[PDB]
């Protein structure tokens, strides 16, 4: 029931275009996080509608290793998201 195939489709020096394959079942929405791998800095959280399978991320810093994580919410009645799917990308 987990989203799959998380990837960086394209990148400029400060923004990323990412995509993933949706689970077959209804997705209420996605929460996507990004922040520095191993970085003791604030991880940013944003959301994406359940019918989308792409997003952009911007205001990134050159030369930083980012961990990008997608959580799918599959329920309206309890707000426990699915198992995270994660990738690393160096700007």
């Amino acid at each position: 029931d987990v989203p799959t195939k998380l990837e960086v489709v394209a990148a400029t020096p400060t923004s990323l275009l990412i995509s993933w394959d949706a689970p077959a079942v209804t997705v209420v929405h996605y929460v996507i996080t990004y922040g520095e791998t191993g970085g003791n800095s604030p991880v940013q959280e944003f959301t994406v509608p359940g019918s989308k399978s792409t997003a952009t991320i911007s205001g990134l810093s050159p030369g930083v290793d980012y961990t990008i994580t997608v959580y799918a919410l599959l329920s309206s009645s309890h707000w426990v998201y699915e198992s995270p799917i994660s990738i690393n990308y160096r700007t």
């Binding site: 400029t12 400060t14 923004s15 275009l17 509608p49 989308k52 952009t56 911007s58 205001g59």
Partner: protein
């Protein structure tokens, strides 16, 4: 520049909403006023709704939607807003069908 897939030329605010009606988040078009060509706007779909943004011209002639990001040409402005929202409710991606 009607050569671009996203530049629809003289189209109205209302027609723009019809042209976007079966779009998704990031569907958009750029339009001209049908009375006064020279007033250009971006119409952009987001969560069932269409947002309209006047394209402003600056003192030095540069085009912008946000004061901080100004460009010589309209293509440059659209291209920038495809990678950072920078004032718009979302990024520009999918041209409305013509």
């Amino acid at each position: 520049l009607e050569k671009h897939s996203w530049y629809h030329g003289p189209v109205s605010r209302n027609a723009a909403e019809y042209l976007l009606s079966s779009g998704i988040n990031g569907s958009f078009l750029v339009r001209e006023s049908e009375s006064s060509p020279g007033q250009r706007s971006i119409s952009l779909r987001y969560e069932g709704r269409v947002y309209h943004y006047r394209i402003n011209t600056a003192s030095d002639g540069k085009l912008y939607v946000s004061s901080e990001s100004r460009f010589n040409t309209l293509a440059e402005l659209v291209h920038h807003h495809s990678t950072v929202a920078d004032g718009l409710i979302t990024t520009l991606h999918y041209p409305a069908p013509k």
